[PDB]
C-alpha cells in the first residue's frame, strides 16, 4: 500500500509539472493568438468599409444576400480544436452545434457538417453523423490559406452538387480572457443592414460580386483566429485546474502515505514487543 501511494505521489508530481508547463505555454500562446487576432483587424475593417460602399452602390441581388426560396439543407462549420487538454472548449462548441442542429430541424432545414479540428470529427463519427469535408492540423496556428479553402468550399456548397441553402459557423468567440463563449453566426445569406448615411472600376456589380467571397473568407479567418485564441485560453484554464487538482491529489496521497508509514511503524513495533513480551 505504501509503495502504491509513493508511486502515485510520483506520478502526480510529474503530472503537476507537465500541466504547469502546459499552463504557462498556453499563457504565451494566448498572447500570440490575441496578437494575431488584432493584426488581422485592419484588413477586416477596411474590407468591411469598402464592402459597405459597394453595397451602397450595388444592386444587392448577389446570391449570398438573398434567401433561397425553400431552404432544404443548411451547412454548419463547427470549429473545434485538434488537440486535447483544452477543457470544455470542444464540449461547449459541440453542444452549441447540436443546439443549432435542433433549431435548424425545428425550421425544417437539414444540417450538413463541415468540421474543423480533429476532436469534432471524433465527436461526430461516434454519433454516426457524416462530415462532407473536414480540415485538421491548423486550429492552433491558423493561416489565411486554411480560411480561404474553408470559405471556398462553403460558398461553393451554398451556390450549388447537392449544395446548401444556408450556412452557419459555430466557434468559440474570445470575448475576454476569462470568458470564451461558443457562438453560432449565419455567414450566408448575409442580411442587408440599411443605416443612415466614391468611384468603382469595373462597375460596382462585378466588383461587389468578386469582393463578397473575400468578405466571407476574411470572416472565416477571423473566426478561426478567435477560435484558436479561445482554445489557448481554455487550455490555460484547464491546465491550471489540472495543476491544482494534481497538487490536491499530491497532498491527499502524502497524508495517506504518512498514515501508512506511521501505521507500519506501529504494527512493526507491536509485533516486536509482542514477541518480546512472550519471551
Amino acid at each position: 500500500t505504501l509503495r502504491e501511494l509513493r508511486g502515485r505521489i510520483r506520478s502526480a508530481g510529474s503530472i503537476k509539472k507537465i500541466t504547469k508547463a502546459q499552463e504557462l505555454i498556453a499563457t504565451s500562446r494566448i498572447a500570440k493568438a490575441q496578437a494575431r487576432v488584432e493584426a488581422a483587424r485592419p484588413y477586416a475593417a477596411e474590407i468591411t468599409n469598402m464592402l459597405t460602399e459597394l453595397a451602397g452602390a450595388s444592386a444587392l441581388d448577389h446570391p449570398l444576400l438573398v434567401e433561397r426560396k425553400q431552404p432544404k439543407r443548411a451547412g454548419v462549420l463547427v470549429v473545434s480544436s485538434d488537440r486535447g487538454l483544452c477543457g470544455a472548449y470542444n464540449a461547449n462548441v459541440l453542444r452549441r452545434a447540436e443546439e443549432l442542429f435542433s433549431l435548424l430541424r425545428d425550421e425544417g432545414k437539414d444540417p450538413v457538417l463541415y468540421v474543423v479540428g480533429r476532436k469534432a470529427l471524433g465527436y461526430f463519427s461516434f454519433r454516426q453523423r457524416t462530415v462532407v469535408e473536414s480540415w485538421t492540423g491548423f486550429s492552433e496556428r491558423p493561416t489565411y490559406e486554411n480560411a480561404r479553402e474553408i470559405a471556398d468550399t462553403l460558398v461553393n456548397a451554398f451556390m450549388a452538387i447537392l449544395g446548401v441553402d444556408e450556412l452557419h459557423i459555430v466557434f468559440t468567440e474570445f470575448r475576454s480572457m476569462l470568458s470564451q463563449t461558443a457562438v453560432a453566426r449565419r455567414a450566408a445569406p448575409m442580411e442587408v443592414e440599411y443605416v443612415g448615411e466614391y468611384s468603382f472600376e469595373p462597375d460596382p456589380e462585378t466588383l461587389f460580386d468578386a469582393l463578397l467571397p473575400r468578405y466571407i473568407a476574411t470572416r472565416v479567418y477571423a473566426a478561426l483566429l478567435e477560435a484558436a485564441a479561445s482554445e489557448s485560453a481554455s487550455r490555460r484554464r484547464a491546465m491550471k485546474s489540472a495543476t491544482d487538482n494534481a497538487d490536491d491529489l499530491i497532498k491527499a496521497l502524502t497524508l495517506a502515505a504518512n498514515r501508512e508509514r506511521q501505521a507500519q511503524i506501529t504494527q512493526e513495533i507491536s509485533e516486536i514487543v509482542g514477541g518480546a513480551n512472550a519471551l
Binding site: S179, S234, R237, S241
Partner: protein, 50 residues
C-alpha cells in the same frame, strides 16, 4: 453553493440561475460568519438568517 463555486472557478461562463445561486451563497456564507465571543440570542439569529 460550495460545489457550484468549485465548478465555476474554471468554467468559461455562468448562467443566470447559476450566477444568482452563487451570489446568494456568497452572502449566506458572509452572513454565517460571526465574531468570537459574540454569541447571538436565538431571535437575533432568526432575524439574521431571515
Amino acid at each position: 453553493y460550495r460545489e457550484l463555486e468549485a465548478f465555476a472557478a474554471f468554467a468559461s461562463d455562468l448562467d443566470a440561475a447559476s450566477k444568482a445561486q452563487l451570489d446568494r451563497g456568497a452572502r449566506l456564507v458572509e452572513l454565517l460568519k460571526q465574531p468570537q465571543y459574540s454569541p447571538l440570542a436565538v431571535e437575533e439569529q432568526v432575524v439574521a438568517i431571515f
